Amino acid sequence: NDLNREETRLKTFTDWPLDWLDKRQLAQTGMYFTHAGDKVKCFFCGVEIGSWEQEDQPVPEHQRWSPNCPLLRRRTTNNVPINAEALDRILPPISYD
Amino acid sequence: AVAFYIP
Ligand SMILES: [Zn+2]
């Protein structure tokens, strides 16, 4: 469960093929690299996303396919960020769906 | 993007 740690997730992004898609923001928002193409997987909701298009963004795409992710929904999780404030800044604004 | 796995 060191993957609960952003630091650990960030480390899996070795040989990340997308120079334009921020691996730091992906790791920060629950994702880790699966090393299969460009697909990443959220450690908190389990969604797997790949075939990224340059118009795609880390958080919105994540919310799009997993609107109920505990991390994005801002409910408690075992996530250990590197910088809490940076995480707060990027997570979707509180919105009761 | 494409979701290969959906919760
Ligand atoms: Zn998630």
PDB file of C-alpha atoms and ligand atoms in Angstrom:
ATOM      1  CA  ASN A   1       0.000   0.000   0.000  1.00  0.00           C
ATOM      2  CA  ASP A   2       2.891   2.356  -0.476  1.00  0.00           C
ATOM      3  CA  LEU A   3       0.852   3.235  -3.578  1.00  0.00           C
ATOM      4  CA  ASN A   4      -1.380   5.153  -1.190  1.00  0.00           C
ATOM      5  CA  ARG A   5       1.570   7.540  -1.186  1.00  0.00           C
ATOM      6  CA  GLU A   6       1.838  10.037  -4.032  1.00  0.00           C
ATOM      7  CA  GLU A   7       5.610   9.640  -3.778  1.00  0.00           C
ATOM      8  CA  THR A   8       5.339   5.942  -4.548  1.00  0.00           C
ATOM      9  CA  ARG A   9       2.898   6.478  -7.420  1.00  0.00           C
ATOM     10  CA  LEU A  10       5.189   9.150  -8.919  1.00  0.00           C
ATOM     11  CA  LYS A  11       8.031   6.595  -8.997  1.00  0.00           C
ATOM     12  CA  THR A  12       6.060   4.266 -11.278  1.00  0.00           C
ATOM     13  CA  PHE A  13       6.101   6.881 -14.048  1.00  0.00           C
ATOM     14  CA  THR A  14       9.507   5.847 -15.357  1.00  0.00           C
ATOM     15  CA  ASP A  15       9.491   5.583 -19.156  1.00  0.00           C
ATOM     16  CA  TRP A  16       6.272   7.640 -19.277  1.00  0.00           C
ATOM     17  CA  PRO A  17       5.631   8.128 -23.039  1.00  0.00           C
ATOM     18  CA  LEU A  18       3.644  11.397 -22.880  1.00  0.00           C
ATOM     19  CA  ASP A  19       5.917  14.442 -22.466  1.00  0.00           C
ATOM     20  CA  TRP A  20       2.903  16.785 -22.657  1.00  0.00           C
ATOM     21  CA  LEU A  21       0.777  15.044 -19.987  1.00  0.00           C
ATOM     22  CA  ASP A  22       2.049  15.836 -16.474  1.00  0.00           C
ATOM     23  CA  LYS A  23       2.920  12.576 -14.692  1.00  0.00           C
ATOM     24  CA  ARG A  24       3.233  14.576 -11.458  1.00  0.00           C
ATOM     25  CA  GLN A  25      -0.414  15.699 -11.596  1.00  0.00           C
ATOM     26  CA  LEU A  26      -1.540  12.197 -12.549  1.00  0.00           C
ATOM     27  CA  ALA A  27       0.319  10.658  -9.593  1.00  0.00           C
ATOM     28  CA  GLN A  28      -0.945  13.474  -7.376  1.00  0.00           C
ATOM     29  CA  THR A  29      -4.559  12.678  -8.276  1.00  0.00           C
ATOM     30  CA  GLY A  30      -4.426   8.950  -7.518  1.00  0.00           C
ATOM     31  CA  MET A  31      -2.866   7.537 -10.675  1.00  0.00           C
ATOM     32  CA  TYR A  32       0.056   5.171 -11.127  1.00  0.00           C
ATOM     33  CA  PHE A  33       1.596   3.962 -14.394  1.00  0.00           C
ATOM     34  CA  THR A  34       0.699   0.400 -15.445  1.00  0.00           C
ATOM     35  CA  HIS A  35       3.511   0.266 -18.037  1.00  0.00           C
ATOM     36  CA  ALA A  36       1.113  -0.887 -20.735  1.00  0.00           C
ATOM     37  CA  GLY A  37       0.877   1.773 -23.412  1.00  0.00           C
ATOM     38  CA  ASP A  38      -0.114   5.029 -21.741  1.00  0.00           C
ATOM     39  CA  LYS A  39      -2.704   3.631 -19.337  1.00  0.00           C
ATOM     40  CA  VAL A  40      -2.721   4.658 -15.688  1.00  0.00           C
ATOM     41  CA  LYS A  41      -4.921   3.333 -12.891  1.00  0.00           C
ATOM     42  CA  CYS A  42      -6.373   5.100  -9.873  1.00  0.00           C
ATOM     43  CA  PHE A  43      -5.340   3.453  -6.613  1.00  0.00           C
ATOM     44  CA  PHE A  44      -8.538   4.667  -4.964  1.00  0.00           C
ATOM     45  CA  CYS A  45     -11.392   3.917  -7.379  1.00  0.00           C
ATOM     46  CA  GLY A  46      -9.568   1.537  -9.709  1.00  0.00           C
ATOM     47  CA  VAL A  47     -10.506   3.230 -12.987  1.00  0.00           C
ATOM     48  CA  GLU A  48      -8.022   2.581 -15.806  1.00  0.00           C
ATOM     49  CA  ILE A  49      -7.527   5.276 -18.455  1.00  0.00           C
ATOM     50  CA  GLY A  50      -5.360   5.281 -21.571  1.00  0.00           C
ATOM     51  CA  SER A  51      -5.286   6.446 -25.193  1.00  0.00           C
ATOM     52  CA  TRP A  52      -4.862  10.010 -23.948  1.00  0.00           C
ATOM     53  CA  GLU A  53      -5.578  12.844 -26.391  1.00  0.00           C
ATOM     54  CA  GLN A  54      -3.670  16.115 -26.016  1.00  0.00           C
ATOM     55  CA  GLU A  55      -6.913  17.974 -25.292  1.00  0.00           C
ATOM     56  CA  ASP A  56      -7.431  15.752 -22.225  1.00  0.00           C
ATOM     57  CA  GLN A  57      -6.673  16.855 -18.679  1.00  0.00           C
ATOM     58  CA  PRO A  58      -5.772  14.629 -15.672  1.00  0.00           C
ATOM     59  CA  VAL A  59      -8.558  15.513 -13.228  1.00  0.00           C
ATOM     60  CA  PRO A  60     -11.500  16.109 -15.603  1.00  0.00           C
ATOM     61  CA  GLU A  61     -10.838  12.882 -17.541  1.00  0.00           C
ATOM     62  CA  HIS A  62     -10.590  11.027 -14.236  1.00  0.00           C
ATOM     63  CA  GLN A  63     -13.865  12.529 -12.985  1.00  0.00           C
ATOM     64  CA  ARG A  64     -15.485  11.843 -16.346  1.00  0.00           C
ATOM     65  CA  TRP A  65     -15.057   8.074 -16.083  1.00  0.00           C
ATOM     66  CA  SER A  66     -15.156   7.740 -12.291  1.00  0.00           C
ATOM     67  CA  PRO A  67     -17.356  10.572 -10.931  1.00  0.00           C
ATOM     68  CA  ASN A  68     -17.651   8.787  -7.592  1.00  0.00           C
ATOM     69  CA  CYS A  69     -13.919   8.312  -6.886  1.00  0.00           C
ATOM     70  CA  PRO A  70     -13.310   8.785  -3.121  1.00  0.00           C
ATOM     71  CA  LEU A  71     -10.220  10.902  -3.791  1.00  0.00           C
ATOM     72  CA  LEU A  72     -11.907  13.273  -6.247  1.00  0.00           C
ATOM     73  CA  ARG A  73     -15.146  13.437  -4.238  1.00  0.00           C
ATOM     74  CA  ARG A  74     -13.050  14.715  -1.329  1.00  0.00           C
ATOM     75  CA  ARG A  75     -14.044  11.966   1.106  1.00  0.00           C
ATOM     76  CA  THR A  76     -11.474  10.343   3.423  1.00  0.00           C
ATOM     77  CA  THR A  77      -8.887   7.980   1.911  1.00  0.00           C
ATOM     78  CA  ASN A  78      -5.497   6.551   2.889  1.00  0.00           C
ATOM     79  CA  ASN A  79      -3.757   8.807   0.376  1.00  0.00           C
ATOM     80  CA  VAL A  80      -0.553  10.434   1.588  1.00  0.00           C
ATOM     81  CA  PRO A  81       0.182  13.424  -0.640  1.00  0.00           C
ATOM     82  CA  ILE A  82       3.606  15.031  -1.023  1.00  0.00           C
ATOM     83  CA  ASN A  83       2.007  18.433  -0.536  1.00  0.00           C
ATOM     84  CA  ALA A  84      -1.556  18.576   0.829  1.00  0.00           C
ATOM     85  CA  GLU A  85      -2.199  22.124  -0.305  1.00  0.00           C
ATOM     86  CA  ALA A  86      -1.185  21.296  -3.906  1.00  0.00           C
ATOM     87  CA  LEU A  87      -3.609  18.369  -3.835  1.00  0.00           C
ATOM     88  CA  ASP A  88      -6.429  20.556  -2.476  1.00  0.00           C
ATOM     89  CA  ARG A  89      -5.738  23.039  -5.249  1.00  0.00           C
ATOM     90  CA  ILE A  90      -6.185  20.453  -7.995  1.00  0.00           C
ATOM     91  CA  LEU A  91      -9.045  18.259  -6.721  1.00  0.00           C
ATOM     92  CA  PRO A  92     -12.502  19.088  -8.153  1.00  0.00           C
ATOM     93  CA  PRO A  93     -14.409  21.803  -6.251  1.00  0.00           C
ATOM     94  CA  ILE A  94     -16.993  20.476  -3.816  1.00  0.00           C
ATOM     95  CA  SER A  95     -20.189  19.860  -5.755  1.00  0.00           C
ATOM     96  CA  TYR A  96     -23.125  17.801  -4.571  1.00  0.00           C
ATOM     97  CA  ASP A  97     -24.254  15.717  -7.519  1.00  0.00           C
TER      98      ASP A  97
ATOM     99  CA  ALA B   1      -9.275   9.361 -23.322  1.00  0.00           C
ATOM    100  CA  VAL B   2     -10.560   5.786 -23.094  1.00  0.00           C
ATOM    101  CA  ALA B   3     -11.573   4.047 -19.872  1.00  0.00           C
ATOM    102  CA  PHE B   4     -10.486   0.413 -19.997  1.00  0.00           C
ATOM    103  CA  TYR B   5     -11.902  -0.218 -16.521  1.00  0.00           C
ATOM    104  CA  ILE B   6     -14.960   1.489 -15.038  1.00  0.00           C
ATOM    105  CA  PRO B   7     -15.830   1.279 -11.304  1.00  0.00           C
TER     106      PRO B   7
HETATM  107 ZN    ZN C   1     -10.034   7.500  -8.727  1.00  0.00          ZN
END
